[PDB]
């Protein structure tokens, strides 16, 4: 193991809860020292999924919103890693749902990207902004649509995420779904308002991006929606 220059953070990552308890209770200041990457024992326990070490640190009242030097908060780390129980304990203690890291991502970007449905819901229920944009103006839906995470796209739409935000290459989630052949995602999106008209930076709409079978289907769906609704 041995991921940090600070030994109490290695105990946190290692899951050595009893040793970690004995050292911190001997000198409580140790629970919040930051290591060379500006992580504390809380970041590392989240990173390794040791729920019990997280509960001991939150029981002591340590800060739950501090970021490491790449701007990752304990909530980002747990949400991307898929710690449902850790995510949940963090939120109960006030973790900031819209915190952003150095790539401009919120924890929902990572939950959406990695198909963490239950965590995405906890986040959105906790007030996360579905429309947060990262440093390339990409949203959680760009991630989910690109990757083919259909149910994640359903959950985002349910919390009212916008479907027509353009990243810096001018792509909406629909262009990404078309580009990677995410057929059901593309269809669901058009059925919920994604426009088949928006052009990205290369002057292409999602239809010009799509293979022809898909483009025909989306076209049809788009005229369906423009006729009714």
């Amino acid at each position: 193991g041995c991921v940090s220059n600070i030994m109490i953070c290695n105990l946190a990552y290692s899951g050595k809860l009893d040793e970690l308890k004995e050292r911190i209770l001997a000198d409580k200041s140790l629970a919040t020292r930051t290591d060379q990457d500006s992580r504390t024992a809380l970041h590392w326990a989240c990173s390794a999924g040791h729920t019990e070490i997280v509960e001991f640190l939150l029981q002591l009242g340590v800060p739950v919103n501090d970021k490491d030097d790449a701007g990752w908060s304990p909530l980002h780390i747990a949400a991307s890693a898929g710690f449902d129980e850790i995510v949940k304990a963090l939120l109960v203690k006030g973790a900031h749902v819209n915190a952003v890291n150095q790539n401009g991502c919120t924890p929902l970007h990572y939950a959406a990207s990695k198909n963490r449905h239950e965590i995405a819901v906890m986040l959105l229920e906790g007030g996360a902004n579905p429309d947060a944009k990262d440093h390339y103006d990409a949203t959680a839906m760009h991630r989910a649509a690109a990757k083919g995470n259909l149910k994640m796209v359903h959950i985002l739409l349910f919390y009212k995420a916008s479907t027509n935000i353009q990243d810096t290459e001018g792509n909406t989630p629909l262009h990404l779904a078309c580009d990677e052949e995410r057929v059901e995602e593309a269809k669901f999106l058009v059925t919920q308002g994604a426009s088949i008209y928006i052009e990205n930076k290369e002057e292409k709409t999602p239809l010009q991006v799509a293979k022809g079978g898909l483009g025909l289907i989306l076209k049809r769906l788009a005229e369906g929606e423009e006729a009714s609704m």
Partner: protein, 73 residues
């Protein structure tokens, strides 16, 4: 190259790398940089090699953002 291919290359190689449970390769896969599959095996080999200058035996998010910014330009 192709976003989909790019992601396939990243995931296939890091598949026998041990990465921390929070790393998400999409943050790099989604960048608008045209890079080859050589460049990717490259970021990936550099990341594991740097597992060693701060010296952690598991590969972390920071190993990548480094590898990535050095390798691409």
């Amino acid at each position: 190259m192709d976003r989909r291919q790019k992601r396939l290359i990243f995931s296939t190689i890091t598949s026998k790398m041990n990465l921390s449970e929070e790393v998400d390769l999409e943050d790099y896969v989604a960048r608008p940089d045209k890079i080859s599959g050589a460049d990717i095996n490259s970021i990936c080999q550099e990341s594991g090699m740097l597992a060693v200058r701060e010296n952690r035996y598991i590969v972390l998010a920071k190993d990548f953002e480094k590898a990535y910014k050095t390798v691409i330009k």
